[PDB]
């Protein structure tokens, strides 16, 4: 579908989609939110996949 | 008054604010004591029902 | 040794502050396979000493800004973890409360950091002209945006009504004089209308010659003033086709302004007090507010 979106025009101009430096603040996470992330399914699945 | 209140306090024993970490208020033990009256100026006195 | 590869890439990033491509690393260190270079880059990103740029030439790796330091008291990590979104906001600035929410830190934490950063000339705090609430913070080198602060009209967070009034008066007088001269010329209606027309660049040059105020007025500033005069119903603008000339502002188009008379005199409705009465809704035949005892007609007939 992304390819189809890009295929609207037969020739696509070289996009000036330079990835602006969106280096995000490593926000100090509230301990409640850190516990929520630890208990999140994605975190457990990533930990399983680490092995 | 002999068991449940201690369980409730243990559930909420530590309270702290997000602002200024390393500051906390920790409950250790809770007592209800004997019935008393606050009529006496900053002094308690045993009172019958 | 991957540690040696990481150190060499760090040295290369030091040599090129603008960032290095994979080609530069490969040319500098040719005996190392591409997989080892990719692993080293990934580790360097994992510990956060590098940032990735996507340019039209490909991927660039740049060292994270740590040498540029304004708040070294405490930790360099939080110093850069404030300067980072300070730079991200950039020319538009950022309010202190917004900074606190973006850095997820208490007010005192960011307070000390902001004072220290301003001490080492890393961030400049300017007063928000658009909504005078809090002081926005920008990079010291970055030029402040004319929208978020400053502007030829705003002087110390104050709109200049006198300045815009004088600008309107002078521009309208110039346009009216030009139209009067064009009418008196009576050489030919086409030439009369064309000479009555005044270019935005021409009136801007005339205003600069007048030099009423010290602040430099750009061409689009006078264009906005003339647009306000248009909205006042006193001047008329037409966009004509001119490929290039002394103006050269809009591609193939130039805006010509001429003072124009109003369509009609004031209507008959406003010549009666009831047409201008503010309590017209409450006016009634028999009541407190009645035309028989109306004060407005009393003053109007007495006058
Ligand atoms: S009669 Fe007097 S109050 Fe009523 S609309 Fe006319 S001016 Fe206004």
Coordinates of C-alpha atoms and ligand atoms in Angstrom, one line a residue:
Chain A
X1 CA 0.0 0.0 0.0
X2 CA 2.9 2.4 0.7
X3 CA 4.3 1.5 -2.8
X4 CA 0.8 2.2 -4.3
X5 CA 0.8 5.6 -2.5
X6 CA 4.2 6.3 -4.0
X7 CA 3.0 5.2 -7.4
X8 CA 0.4 7.9 -7.8
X9 CA 3.0 9.7 -10.0
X10 CA 5.0 7.7 -12.5
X11 CA 8.1 9.7 -11.7
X12 CA 8.6 10.9 -8.1
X13 CA 10.8 14.0 -7.4
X14 CA 13.6 13.3 -5.0
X15 CA 11.9 14.1 -1.8
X16 CA 13.5 16.7 0.5
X17 CA 12.3 14.5 3.4
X18 CA 15.5 15.0 5.4
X19 CA 14.9 13.4 8.7
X20 CA 14.9 16.6 10.9
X21 CA 16.8 15.8 14.1
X22 CA 13.9 14.6 16.3
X23 CA 16.2 13.3 19.1
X24 CA 13.7 13.1 21.9
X25 CA 14.1 14.0 25.5
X26 CA 14.7 10.9 27.6
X27 CA 11.9 12.0 29.9
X28 CA 12.5 10.8 33.4
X29 CA 9.6 8.4 33.6
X30 CA 7.3 8.4 36.6
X31 CA 7.7 5.2 38.6
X32 CA 4.0 4.3 37.9
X33 CA 4.6 4.7 34.2
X34 CA 7.8 2.7 34.4
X35 CA 5.9 -0.1 36.2
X36 CA 3.2 0.1 33.5
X37 CA 5.8 -0.3 30.7
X38 CA 7.5 -3.2 32.5
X39 CA 4.1 -4.9 32.8
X40 CA 3.2 -4.1 29.2
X41 CA 2.8 -7.0 26.8
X42 CA 5.3 -5.6 24.3
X43 CA 8.0 -5.4 26.9
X44 CA 7.5 -9.0 28.0
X45 CA 7.5 -10.1 24.3
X46 CA 10.8 -8.2 23.7
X47 CA 12.3 -9.8 26.7
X48 CA 11.3 -13.2 25.5
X49 CA 12.7 -12.5 22.0
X50 CA 16.0 -11.4 23.6
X51 CA 16.8 -15.0 24.3
Chain B
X1 CA -9.6 -1.9 64.7
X2 CA -7.1 -4.6 65.6
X3 CA -6.1 -6.1 62.2
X4 CA -7.7 -4.3 59.2
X5 CA -6.5 -0.8 60.0
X6 CA -2.9 -2.0 60.1
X7 CA -3.5 -3.7 56.7
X8 CA -4.8 -0.4 55.3
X9 CA -1.9 1.6 56.6
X10 CA 0.5 -1.0 55.3
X11 CA -1.1 -0.7 51.9
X12 CA -0.5 3.1 52.1
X13 CA 2.6 3.2 54.3
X14 CA 4.8 5.5 52.1
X15 CA 3.7 8.8 50.5
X16 CA 6.0 11.0 48.4
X17 CA 5.7 13.8 45.9
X18 CA 7.1 13.8 42.4
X19 CA 8.6 17.2 43.0
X20 CA 11.8 17.2 45.1
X21 CA 12.6 13.4 45.1
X22 CA 14.3 11.8 48.1
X23 CA 11.6 13.4 50.3
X24 CA 9.1 11.0 51.8
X25 CA 6.7 10.4 54.7
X26 CA 6.7 6.8 56.0
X27 CA 4.1 5.4 58.4
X28 CA 5.5 2.8 60.9
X29 CA 2.7 1.8 63.3
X30 CA -0.8 2.9 64.1
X31 CA -2.7 2.9 67.4
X32 CA -6.3 3.8 68.4
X33 CA -5.9 3.8 72.1
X34 CA -8.6 4.1 74.7
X35 CA -11.6 6.5 74.5
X36 CA -10.8 10.0 75.8
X37 CA -12.3 13.5 75.8
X38 CA -10.5 16.7 74.5
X39 CA -12.4 19.0 76.9
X40 CA -9.4 19.5 79.1
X41 CA -7.1 22.1 77.6
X42 CA -4.6 20.0 75.6
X43 CA -5.2 17.2 78.1
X44 CA -7.2 14.0 77.7
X45 CA -9.4 12.4 80.4
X46 CA -11.1 9.0 80.5
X47 CA -14.8 9.3 79.7
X48 CA -17.6 6.9 80.3
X49 CA -20.2 6.4 77.5
Chain C
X1 CA 38.5 -5.1 18.5
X2 CA 35.1 -3.4 18.1
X3 CA 36.2 -0.9 20.8
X4 CA 39.0 0.3 18.5
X5 CA 36.5 0.6 15.7
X6 CA 34.2 2.7 17.8
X7 CA 37.0 4.9 18.9
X8 CA 38.2 5.4 15.3
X9 CA 34.6 6.3 14.3
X10 CA 34.4 8.7 17.2
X11 CA 37.7 10.3 16.1
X12 CA 36.4 10.5 12.5
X13 CA 33.2 12.3 13.7
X14 CA 35.5 14.7 15.7
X15 CA 37.3 15.4 12.4
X16 CA 34.1 16.1 10.6
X17 CA 31.6 18.1 12.8
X18 CA 29.0 18.0 10.0
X19 CA 28.8 14.2 10.0
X20 CA 30.5 11.3 8.2
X21 CA 29.0 8.9 5.7
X22 CA 29.7 5.2 5.4
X23 CA 31.9 6.0 2.4
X24 CA 34.3 8.1 4.5
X25 CA 34.6 5.4 7.2
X26 CA 35.2 2.7 4.5
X27 CA 37.9 4.8 2.8
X28 CA 39.6 5.6 6.1
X29 CA 39.4 2.1 7.5
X30 CA 39.3 -0.2 4.5
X31 CA 40.4 -3.6 6.0
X32 CA 37.2 -3.9 8.1
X33 CA 34.1 -5.6 6.7
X34 CA 30.8 -3.8 6.3
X35 CA 29.1 -5.9 8.9
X36 CA 31.6 -4.9 11.6
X37 CA 31.2 -1.3 10.7
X38 CA 27.4 -1.6 10.9
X39 CA 27.7 -3.3 14.3
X40 CA 30.0 -0.6 15.6
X41 CA 27.6 2.1 14.4
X42 CA 24.7 0.3 16.1
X43 CA 26.6 0.1 19.4
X44 CA 27.6 3.8 19.2
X45 CA 23.9 4.7 18.6
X46 CA 22.9 2.4 21.4
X47 CA 25.0 4.2 24.0
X48 CA 23.8 7.5 22.4
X49 CA 27.1 9.1 21.4
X50 CA 26.0 9.4 17.7
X51 CA 23.0 10.9 15.9
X52 CA 21.7 9.9 12.4
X53 CA 21.1 12.4 9.6
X54 CA 19.2 11.5 6.4
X55 CA 20.5 13.8 3.6
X56 CA 20.0 13.7 -0.1
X57 CA 23.4 11.9 -0.3
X58 CA 22.4 9.2 2.2
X59 CA 23.1 8.5 5.9
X60 CA 25.4 10.7 8.0
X61 CA 26.7 10.0 11.5
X62 CA 27.4 13.0 13.8
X63 CA 28.8 13.1 17.3
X64 CA 26.2 14.2 19.9
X65 CA 26.7 17.8 21.1
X66 CA 28.5 17.6 24.4
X67 CA 31.4 20.0 23.9
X68 CA 28.9 22.9 23.6
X69 CA 28.2 23.2 27.3
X70 CA 26.3 25.9 29.2
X71 CA 25.2 24.1 32.4
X72 CA 28.1 21.8 33.5
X73 CA 27.2 22.0 37.2
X74 CA 25.7 18.6 38.0
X75 CA 25.3 16.5 34.9
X76 CA 26.1 17.1 31.2
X77 CA 23.4 14.6 30.4
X78 CA 20.5 16.9 31.6
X79 CA 22.3 19.9 30.1
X80 CA 22.1 18.4 26.7
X81 CA 18.7 16.9 27.5
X82 CA 17.5 20.5 27.8
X83 CA 19.5 22.1 25.0
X84 CA 18.2 19.4 22.7
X85 CA 14.6 20.6 22.5
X86 CA 15.8 24.2 23.0
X87 CA 17.5 23.7 19.6
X88 CA 14.5 21.8 18.3
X89 CA 12.3 24.8 19.0
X90 CA 15.0 26.9 17.5
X91 CA 13.9 30.2 16.0
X92 CA 10.3 30.0 17.2
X93 CA 11.4 29.6 20.8
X94 CA 9.7 27.7 23.6
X95 CA 8.0 28.8 26.8
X96 CA 9.4 27.7 30.2
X97 CA 6.3 25.7 31.1
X98 CA 6.4 23.9 27.7
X99 CA 10.1 23.2 28.4
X100 CA 9.2 21.7 31.8
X101 CA 6.5 19.4 30.3
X102 CA 8.9 18.4 27.4
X103 CA 11.8 17.6 29.8
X104 CA 9.5 16.0 32.4
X105 CA 11.3 17.7 35.2
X106 CA 10.2 20.0 38.1
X107 CA 10.2 23.8 37.8
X108 CA 13.4 24.2 40.0
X109 CA 15.3 21.6 38.0
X110 CA 14.8 23.5 34.8
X111 CA 15.2 26.9 36.5
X112 CA 18.8 26.2 37.6
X113 CA 19.5 24.8 34.1
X114 CA 18.1 27.8 32.3
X115 CA 20.0 30.3 34.4
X116 CA 23.2 28.4 34.0
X117 CA 22.7 28.0 30.2
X118 CA 22.1 31.8 29.9
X119 CA 25.3 32.4 31.9
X120 CA 27.4 30.6 29.3
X121 CA 25.6 32.2 26.3
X122 CA 23.9 29.0 25.1
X123 CA 20.2 30.2 25.2
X124 CA 18.6 33.6 25.0
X125 CA 15.3 34.4 26.7
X126 CA 13.1 36.8 24.7
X127 CA 9.6 38.2 25.6
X128 CA 6.8 36.6 23.7
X129 CA 5.3 39.4 21.6
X130 CA 2.4 37.4 20.2
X131 CA 1.0 36.5 23.7
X132 CA 3.0 38.2 26.5
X133 CA 2.9 35.3 28.9
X134 CA 6.3 33.9 29.5
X135 CA 9.9 34.3 28.2
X136 CA 10.7 32.0 25.3
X137 CA 14.1 30.4 25.0
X138 CA 16.2 30.1 21.8
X139 CA 19.7 29.3 20.8
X140 CA 21.9 32.3 21.2
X141 CA 23.2 32.3 17.6
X142 CA 19.8 31.8 16.0
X143 CA 18.1 35.0 14.8
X144 CA 14.6 35.5 16.4
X145 CA 11.6 34.9 14.2
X146 CA 9.8 38.1 13.2
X147 CA 6.4 36.3 14.0
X148 CA 7.2 34.9 17.4
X149 CA 9.0 38.1 18.5
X150 CA 9.8 41.6 17.2
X151 CA 8.2 43.0 14.0
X152 CA 8.4 46.5 12.6
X153 CA 5.2 47.4 14.5
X154 CA 5.9 45.9 17.9
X155 CA 8.2 47.9 20.2
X156 CA 8.9 46.2 23.5
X157 CA 5.8 44.0 23.4
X158 CA 3.7 47.1 22.5
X159 CA 1.7 47.5 19.3
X160 CA 2.3 51.0 17.8
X161 CA -1.1 52.4 16.9
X162 CA 0.4 55.9 16.3
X163 CA 3.0 54.5 13.9
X164 CA 0.5 52.6 11.8
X165 CA -1.8 55.6 11.8
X166 CA 0.9 57.9 10.6
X167 CA 1.9 55.3 8.0
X168 CA -1.7 55.2 6.7
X169 CA -1.9 58.9 6.6
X170 CA 1.3 59.4 4.7
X171 CA 0.6 56.6 2.2
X172 CA -2.9 57.8 1.6
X173 CA -1.7 61.4 1.1
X174 CA 0.9 60.2 -1.4
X175 CA -1.6 58.1 -3.3
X176 CA -4.2 61.0 -3.3
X177 CA -1.6 63.5 -4.5
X178 CA -0.5 61.1 -7.3
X179 CA -4.2 60.5 -8.3
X180 CA -4.8 64.3 -8.3
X181 CA -1.7 64.9 -10.6
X182 CA -2.9 62.1 -12.9
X183 CA -6.4 63.6 -13.1
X184 CA -5.0 67.1 -13.8
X185 CA -2.7 65.7 -16.5
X186 CA -5.7 64.7 -18.6
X187 CA -3.4 63.4 -21.3
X188 CA -5.3 60.2 -21.9
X189 CA -7.5 58.0 -19.8
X190 CA -5.3 54.9 -20.0
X191 CA -2.2 56.9 -19.2
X192 CA -4.1 58.8 -16.5
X193 CA -5.0 55.6 -14.8
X194 CA -1.5 54.1 -15.2
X195 CA 0.1 57.2 -13.8
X196 CA -2.4 57.3 -10.9
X197 CA -1.2 53.7 -10.1
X198 CA 1.7 53.5 -7.7
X199 CA 3.9 50.5 -7.3
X200 CA 4.5 48.9 -3.8
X201 CA 8.2 49.4 -4.3
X202 CA 7.7 53.0 -5.3
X203 CA 5.6 53.9 -2.3
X204 CA 8.0 52.0 -0.1
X205 CA 10.9 54.1 -1.4
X206 CA 8.8 57.3 -0.8
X207 CA 8.2 56.2 2.8
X208 CA 11.9 55.4 3.3
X209 CA 12.6 58.9 2.0
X210 CA 10.1 60.3 4.5
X211 CA 11.9 58.3 7.3
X212 CA 9.3 58.9 9.9
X213 CA 10.5 56.1 12.2
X214 CA 14.0 54.6 12.8
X215 CA 12.9 51.0 12.2
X216 CA 13.6 49.8 8.7
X217 CA 10.4 49.0 6.8
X218 CA 10.6 46.2 4.2
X219 CA 8.6 46.3 1.0
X220 CA 6.1 43.8 2.3
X221 CA 5.6 46.0 5.4
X222 CA 4.4 48.8 3.1
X223 CA 2.4 46.2 1.2
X224 CA 0.6 45.2 4.4
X225 CA 0.0 48.9 5.2
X226 CA -1.5 49.4 1.8
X227 CA -3.6 46.3 2.3
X228 CA -5.0 47.8 5.5
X229 CA -5.7 51.0 3.6
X230 CA -7.5 48.9 1.0
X231 CA -9.7 47.4 3.7
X232 CA -10.4 51.0 4.8
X233 CA -12.2 51.5 1.4
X234 CA -10.0 54.3 0.3
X235 CA -7.4 52.7 -2.1
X236 CA -7.6 50.1 -4.8
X237 CA -5.0 47.6 -5.9
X238 CA -4.6 45.7 -9.2
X239 CA -2.1 43.0 -10.0
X240 CA -0.6 43.7 -13.4
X241 CA 1.8 41.5 -15.5
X242 CA 5.4 42.7 -15.4
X243 CA 8.1 40.1 -15.9
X244 CA 11.0 42.1 -14.4
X245 CA 11.9 45.6 -13.4
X246 CA 12.9 47.9 -10.5
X247 CA 10.4 46.0 -8.3
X248 CA 10.9 42.3 -9.3
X249 CA 9.0 41.2 -6.2
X250 CA 6.3 38.8 -7.4
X251 CA 7.1 36.5 -10.3
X252 CA 5.8 38.2 -13.3
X253 CA 3.3 40.3 -11.3
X254 CA 3.4 43.7 -9.7
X255 CA 0.8 45.3 -7.5
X256 CA -0.3 48.8 -8.4
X257 CA -2.2 51.0 -5.9
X258 CA -4.3 54.0 -6.6
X259 CA -6.4 56.3 -4.3
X260 CA -10.1 55.8 -5.2
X261 CA -13.2 57.8 -4.2
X262 CA -16.0 56.0 -2.2
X263 CA -18.8 54.6 -4.3
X264 CA -21.6 56.6 -2.6
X265 CA -21.9 59.3 0.1
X266 CA -23.1 58.2 3.5
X267 CA -26.6 56.7 3.3
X268 CA -29.8 58.3 4.5
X269 CA -30.2 55.8 7.3
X270 CA -27.2 57.1 9.3
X271 CA -28.5 60.6 8.9
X272 CA -31.3 59.7 11.4
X273 CA -30.6 59.0 15.1
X274 CA -32.6 55.8 15.0
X275 CA -30.1 54.5 12.5
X276 CA -27.3 55.0 15.1
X277 CA -29.2 54.3 18.3
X278 CA -27.5 51.7 20.5
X279 CA -30.8 50.8 22.3
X280 CA -32.8 50.5 19.1
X281 CA -34.0 47.1 20.1
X282 CA -35.6 48.4 23.3
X283 CA -37.3 51.3 21.5
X284 CA -41.1 51.0 21.8
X285 CA -44.1 53.3 21.2
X286 CA -45.4 53.1 24.8
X287 CA -42.6 52.5 27.3
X288 CA -39.5 53.9 29.0
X289 CA -37.6 54.3 25.7
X290 CA -40.0 55.9 23.3
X291 CA -39.5 58.1 20.2
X292 CA -41.7 60.8 21.8
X293 CA -39.4 61.2 24.8
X294 CA -36.2 60.0 23.0
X295 CA -33.1 61.9 24.1
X296 CA -31.2 61.3 20.8
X297 CA -33.7 63.1 18.6
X298 CA -33.9 65.9 21.3
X299 CA -30.2 66.6 21.0
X300 CA -30.3 66.1 17.2
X301 CA -33.1 68.6 16.7
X302 CA -31.7 71.0 19.2
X303 CA -28.3 70.8 17.4
Ligands
LIG1 S1 -36.7 56.4 18.8 FE1 -34.8 56.9 20.0 S2 -34.4 55.0 21.2 FE2 -35.9 54.4 19.5 S3 -34.5 53.7 17.8 FE3 -34.9 55.9 17.4 S4 -33.2 57.0 18.4 FE4 -33.2 54.9 19.2

